């Protein structure tokens, strides 16, 4: 299914959408993106919208 990441970082404000087999796979991918971007924030997940938020 489609999963989304809302980036709410100091220098990264955006929305990323990907496809993944499950939420765990999406979250692993999203955490790698955030790590590569130097985003070090607090994570939340909304199951109803399959949307993660990372907030610095």
Q: Is 55 in the site for its own copies (CB under 8 A)?
A: no
The smaller minimum CB distance to its own copies, of residues 19 and 22, is found at 19
Where does 1-56 have alpha helices with state H?
A: 23-37
DSSP conformational letter for 29: H
CA 48, 9, 50 angle in degrees (round to 5)? 15
Q: Is 47 in the site for Na ion (CB under 5 A)?
A: yes
Give the whole-angstrom CA distance, residue 1 versus residue 11.
28
Binding mask 1-40 for its own copies (x = CB under 8 A): ------------xxxxxxx-------------x--xxx--
Residue ranges in contact with its own copies by CB under 8 A: 13-19, 33, 36-38
């Amino acid at each position: 299914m489609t999963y989304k990441l809302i980036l709410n970082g100091k220098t990264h404000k955006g929305v990323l959408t990907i496809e993944a087999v499950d939420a765990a796979t999406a979250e692993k991918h999203f955490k790698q993106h955030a790590n590569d971007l130097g985003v070090d924030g607090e994570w939340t997940y909304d199951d109803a919208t399959k949307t993660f938020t990372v907030t610095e």
